[PDB]
């Protein structure tokens, strides 16, 4: 519309990364925490696509019939774990599509990933970038543990540079779903703190169709948030 070719997947790509690029910016100058907002959000739109999916496979929900978002805390290890029942992901997923951008220098291979899929580097930078690179505000590695219906469970370790996936040695935990799990900064152990999660994921829970609880306490067990 005012420079050359802006409908090259090459353009796509550096406006969707600019688009990001400029969120987590903003969102730094105004001090706004995305990075939960964006896990609880991710979250939900599995939820949402599995359900899609329910729609008309029957024995979609097979493995975990619930529908629930359960996020923990975990203080002594200092870990943060977000755990969804949606679509799950396969390895498949884990090293083309996601492994893909994680990996550096991601934009050699923008041509390698449009050889008609519908999801290309563009299209899931613009929709999963901004969640997964705002986690690396708070976290010095992202861990992804997720069983798909087509797939065995597998986890996916990534610290925005390389990433590497082993299949689960604890077999099919999740029935469905995936857990995101980071490993936060010393600086952001706040974020371990249950009630800064609690007050956080109620906001961001509001308007949220699906349950989403967080593992609260003399006894622990998971809390509704709505
Ligand atoms: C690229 C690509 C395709 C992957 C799509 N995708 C993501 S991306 C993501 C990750 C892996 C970790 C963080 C901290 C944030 C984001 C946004 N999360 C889920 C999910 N929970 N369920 C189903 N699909 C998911
Ligand atoms: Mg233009
Ligand atoms: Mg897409
Ligand atoms: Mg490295």
């Known amino acids: 519309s005012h420079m050359l070719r802006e409908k090259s997947e090459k353009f796509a790509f550096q406006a969707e990364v600019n688009r990001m690029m400029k969120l987590i910016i903003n969102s730094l100058y105004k001090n706004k925490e995305i990075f939960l907002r964006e896990l609880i959000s991710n979250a939900s739109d599995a939820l949402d696509k599995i359900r899609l999916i329910s729609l008309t496979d029957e024995n979609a929900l097979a493995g975990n019939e619930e529908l629930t978002v359960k996020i923990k805390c975990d203080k002594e ?13 396969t390895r498949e997923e884990l090293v083309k599509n996601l492994g893909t951008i994680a990996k550096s220098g991601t934009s050699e291979f ?38 798909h219906n087509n797939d065995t469970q597998h986890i996916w370790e990534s610290d925005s540079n390389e990433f590497s996936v082993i299949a689960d040695p604890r077999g099919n935990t999740l029935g469905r779903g995936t857990t995101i799990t980071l490993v936060l900064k010393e600086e952001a152990s706040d974020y371990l703190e249950l009630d800064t999660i609690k007050n956080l994921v109620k906001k961001y829970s509001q308007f949220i169709n699906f349950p989403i609880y967080v593992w609260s306490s003399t006894v622990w067990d998971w809390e509704l948030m709505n």
């Open 77 to 89: 290890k200092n870990l943060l774990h977000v755990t969804d029942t949606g679509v799950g992901m």
């Open 110 to 147: 923008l041509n390698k990933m449009t050889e008609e899929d519908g999801q290309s580097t563009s299209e899931l930078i613009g929709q999963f970038g901004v969640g997964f690179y705002s986690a690396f505000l708070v976290a010095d590695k992202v861990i992804v543990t997720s069983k």
